[PDB]
Design a protein around this motif. Structure first.
Motif: not given
Ligand SMILES: *C(=O)[C@@H](NC(=O)/C(=N\OC(C)(C)C(=O)O)c1csc(N)n1)[C@@H](CC=C)NC(=O)NS(=O)(=O)n1nc(C2=CC(=O)C(O)C=N2)n(CCCS(C)(=O)=O)c1=O
Length: 500
Positions: A304-332
């Protein structure tokens, strides 16, 4: 003559599960108050009054004597109406009653963390009780009363403001799934000698939390000696490194880059990869060439690290952020933890790899479940809900339907393929998921997945904290819990078996 105003406590709103099974019910309780000046005129009654309240005669007499100037004092709160009637039968001058409410939780420890509980004043203190306190509390009453210099209640002249009851609230929780999840998580903890654990079940189509259980748990009807540890809703307040369970999101970024396809090969030999001072290491180091599904089956950090080096972390971070990992659930839910998804302007090589294999990020079980729900729901994220959803809100297409469908197929192979996580297999259905193990010495055993793999209905996360037996890996410890709970949940929901 003095015009005064008494506050009438309002009836707290009924909390039910999604099918109307009661979960939190306001129970009539009797609060006894006294006018000490009036109590002074009947001292021969005090021992019998103190004995009725289980108090030492002298201690209760010292209580009244010290408050001989105060026009009001509380004797006792929350007596059962029957126990309150027994004190009233004594006919002690200066002793008066107030009809209060106390919560009863019919399912007790089974849904303690999600439902929560009330404080001494019948206000929400934890869980839904706290989160939806305004909806559930309503508004207290105002009674106009006539009093003297001493504090004696003369007459109830009028009702200046009518007490408005709280409103009913139906949760997204299905008590039938909650009991199954509670029981299987409890059994799993005891079989593994584990310290704690969480299990979340989500409806991938509606965003509903169908079950949310943690161990240790507590009986919210018997709160005397409230152990703060047993009261923690770990699923929403305990963060952890998701590790290998985030590799599907790294693959989703790989597949959307235009640079990778499932049949592409990565050379992971010799099971380690040096990047400066840091060493990426696989658990099993007997591989050379692996295809993308193979990297997931073998849980290769090198791969997974070798694939990450090829595509760049930016793309990976963006998917993780968009699915809500480490983000506010808004549940209150006050005190709910957001965790952390690290970010960089320029991503170094070590941080790129560790992001890709879920090291150094911190998420909650609810966030991980919500992310898997988006992947399962053909890449569409539906907002999380702890209440029953009748009209489904619009989702956000976070991953393309094609990439999501490809990743789903690879997760089905993770579970079903030769060398896969066979313990996660759901008899009668095609199941999909990814196991994980995080070194927190001490470990956290993880499994995250969904089913039926062909038309996903439910996503589930199983977190087992500090298993103490020889086998501590997620695929050994959490995978069978996923199997048992999923086999039950799908049948309880009448989902047609799809392994045909
Ligand atoms: C992903 O979770 C990886 N974990 C880590 O990289 C982390 N810690 O690794 C361990 C090994 C716990 C450690 O450092 O001591 C980590 C991530 S974030 C954090 N704080 N720590 C991955 C290891 C790859 C380097 N672990 C998993 O994916 N676990 S798992 O559940 O997928 N799993 N792996 C194995 C396994 C054990 C062996 O001895 C093997 O030879 C091969 N695989 N198992 C057991 C086999 C189950 S099966 C395939 O037969 O169904 C397992 O369940």
């Amino acid at each position: 003559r003095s015009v005064r105003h008494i506050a009438i406590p309002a009836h707290r709103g009924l909390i039910t599960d999604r099918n109307g099974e009661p979960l939190a019910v306001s129970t009539p309780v009797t609060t006894l108050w006294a006018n000490p000046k009036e109590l002074m005129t009947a001292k021969e009654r005090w021992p019998q009054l103190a004995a009725a309240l289980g108090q030492d005669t002298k201690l209760f007499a010292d209580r009244i004597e010290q408050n001989a100037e105060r026009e009001f004092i509380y004797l006792v709160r929350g007596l059962t109406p029957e126990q309150g009637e027994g004190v009233i039968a004594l006919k002690v001058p200066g002793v008066y009653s107030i009809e209060e409410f106390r919560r009863f939780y019919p399912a007790g420890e089974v849904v303690a963390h999600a439902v929560g509980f009330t404080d001494v004043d019948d206000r929400g203190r934890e869980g839904i009780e706290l989160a939806f306190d305004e909806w559930l509390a309503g508004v207290p009453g105002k009674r106009q009363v006539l009093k003297d210099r001493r504090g004696r209640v003369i007459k109830d002249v009028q009702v200046t403001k009518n007490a408005k009851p709280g409103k009913t609230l139906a949760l997204s929780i299905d008590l039938r799934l909650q009991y199954l999840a509670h029981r299987e998580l409890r059994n799993a903890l005891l079989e593994n000698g584990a310290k704690a654990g969480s299990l979340v079940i989500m409806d991938v189509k509606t965003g509903e939390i169908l079950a949310m259980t943690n161990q240790p748990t507590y009986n919210p009807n018997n709160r005397r000696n409230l152990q703060p540890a047993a009261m923690r809703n770990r699923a929403m307040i305990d963060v952890f490194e998701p590790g290998s369970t985030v590799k599907p999101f790294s693959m989703s970024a790989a597949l959307a880059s235009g640079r990778w396809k499932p049949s592409d090969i990565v050379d992971v030999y010799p099971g380690t990869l040096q990047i400066g001072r840091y060493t990426i290491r696989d658990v099993s180091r007997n591989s050379r060439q692996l295809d993308l599904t193979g990297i997931l089956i073998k849980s290769s950090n090198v791969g997974i690290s070798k694939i990450a080096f090829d595509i760049g972390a930016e793309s990976i971070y963006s998917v993780m952020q968009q699915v809500g990992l480490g983000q506010d659930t808004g549940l209150g839910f006050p005190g709910e933890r957001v965790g952390n998804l690290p970010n960089h302007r320029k991503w170094p090589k070590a941080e790129t790899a560790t992001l890709a294999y879920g090291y150094g990020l911190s998420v909650t079980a609810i966030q991980l479940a919500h992310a898997y729900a988006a992947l399962a729901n053909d890449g569409k994220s539906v907002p999380l809900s702890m209440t029953r959803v009748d009209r489904v809100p619009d989702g956000v297409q976070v991953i393309s339907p094609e990439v999501a469908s490809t990743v789903q197929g690879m997760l089905q192979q993770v579970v079903e393929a030769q060398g896969g996580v066979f313990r996660a297999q759901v008899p009668g259905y095609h199941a999909a998921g990814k196991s994980g193990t995080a070194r927190k010495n001490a470990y956290r055993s993880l499994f995250a997945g969904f089913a039926p793999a062909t038309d996903p209905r439910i996503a589930m996360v199983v977190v087992i904290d500090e298993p103490s037996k020889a086998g501590y890996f997620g695929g050994l410890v959490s995978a069978p819990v996923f199997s048992k709970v999923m086999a039950g949940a799908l049948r309880l929901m009448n989902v047609p078996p799809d392994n045909l």
